[PDB]
UniProtKB/Swiss-Prot annotation:
Family per record: Belongs to the eukaryotic release factor 1 family.
Chain positions with Phosphothreonine modification: 71
Post-translational modification, as annotated: Ubiquitinated at Lys-3 via 'Lys-6'-linked polyubiquitin chains by RNF14 and RNF25 in response to ribosome collisions (ribosome stalling), leading to its degradation by the proteasome and rescue of stalled ribosomes.
Part of the whole protein covered: 277 to 437 of 437
Annotated source species: Homo sapiens
Name by which UniProt lists this protein: Eukaryotic peptide chain release factor subunit 1
Cross-link (Glycyl lysine isopeptide (Lys-Gly) (interchain with G-Cter in ubiquitin)): 3
Domain of life: Eukaryota
């Protein structure tokens, strides 16, 4: 099965290149997804046994749409579905198997949707270190997270370069 070897070279190439501080990789759904949207991803690392799914939460008010990943415990809590800035209960419109989704249109994003498992040692590095979703990029790209990213260098170590 290609799975065994696919997960070996792919997964390893993810955690190894990152070992070079090349920032040409990302882990998780949000990141792996965003990078796919960024077209920065060269290859996608998603496991067959992915417990992460995509659910869309919306309210009639259409003033606060929310779509994020939830694990067995997350969907159970349901607290995330609501917000203290709206105090309203969202309404799930649809539910789509993320992993299944990844292989559905990965061609559109231009990323190589490759499946892998935790059977191999490398696989654990992903699931245990991340969760079962990763994204390899072609080259260093600009990432956004906290406010004032363009300058404060939240994820950019280059901030020190500025000093000297």
């Amino acid at each position: 099965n290609v799975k065994f070897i696919q997960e070996k070279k792919l997964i390893g190439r993810y955690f190894d290149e990152i070992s070079q501080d090349t920032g040409k990789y990302c882990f998780g759904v949000e990141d792996t997804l965003k990078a796919l949207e960024m077209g920065a991803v060269e290859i996608l690392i998603v496991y067959e046994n992915l417990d992460i799914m995509r659910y869309v939460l919306h309210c009639q008010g259409t003033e606060e749409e929310k779509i994020l990943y939830l694990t067995p415990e997350q969907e159970k809590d349901k607290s995330h579905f609501t917000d203290k800035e709206t105090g309203q209960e969202h309404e799930l419109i649809e539910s789509m198997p993320l992993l299944e989704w990844f292989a559905n249109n990965y061609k559109k994003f231009g990323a190589t949707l490759e499946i892998v498992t935790d059977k191999s040692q490398e696989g654990s590095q992903f699931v245990k270190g991340f969760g079962g979703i990763g994204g390899i990029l072609r080259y260093r790209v600009d990432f956004q997270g906290m406010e004032y990213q363009g300058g404060d260098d939240e994820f950019f170590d280059l901030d020190d370069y500025l000093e000297h």
